[PDB]
Design an enzyme around this catalytic site. Sequence first.
Site, PDB file in Angstrom:
ATOM      1  N   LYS A  20       0.840  -1.185   0.000  1.00  0.00           N
ATOM      2  CA  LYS A  20       0.000   0.000   0.000  1.00  0.00           C
ATOM      3  C   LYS A  20       0.885   1.248   0.000  1.00  0.00           C
ATOM      4  CE  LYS A  20       0.253  -0.793   4.761  1.00  0.00           C
ATOM      5  NZ  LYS A  20      -0.706  -0.923   5.881  1.00  0.00           N
ATOM      6  N   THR A  37      -0.870   8.711  -1.995  1.00  0.00           N
ATOM      7  CA  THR A  37      -0.731   9.534  -3.185  1.00  0.00           C
ATOM      8  C   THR A  37      -0.918  11.011  -2.836  1.00  0.00           C
ATOM      9  OG1 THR A  37      -2.993   9.452  -3.739  1.00  0.00           O
ATOM     10  CG2 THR A  37      -1.827   7.499  -4.249  1.00  0.00           C
ATOM     11  N   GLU A  79      15.985   9.694   0.907  1.00  0.00           N
ATOM     12  CA  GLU A  79      16.883   8.931   1.760  1.00  0.00           C
ATOM     13  C   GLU A  79      17.438   7.725   1.001  1.00  0.00           C
ATOM     14  OE1 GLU A  79      17.795   7.440   5.529  1.00  0.00           O
ATOM     15  OE2 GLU A  79      19.122   8.916   4.483  1.00  0.00           O
TER      16      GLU A  79
END
EC number: 3.5.1.135
Length: 103
Positions: free
Chosen positions: A21, A24, A74
């Site tokens: 999952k 957005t 990252e």
Amino acid sequence: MQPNDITFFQRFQDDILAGRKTITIRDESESHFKTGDVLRVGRFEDDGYFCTIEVTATSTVTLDTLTEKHAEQENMTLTELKKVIADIYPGQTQFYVIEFKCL
């Protein structure tokens, strides 16, 4: 014919295909579908509206505030971040975020 609901960079699309999952980000001025609805997924590269997905949750936040841009920040460099950002859309200001899951 029918237009697309929401797109997702190739990278994002691939990750999507891998399930997991994800949230957005949309623009109020472009407020598309809503929660508990379906979100047409498709690659911006040239695979738009490829598959269909369903929403799970929604929230109001920026992009890098959750968007893959964070995971990338990252991981990848600024250039890449700018690449994806450019692939997603300009503007780095708070916006509407919609979460979904792959049935």
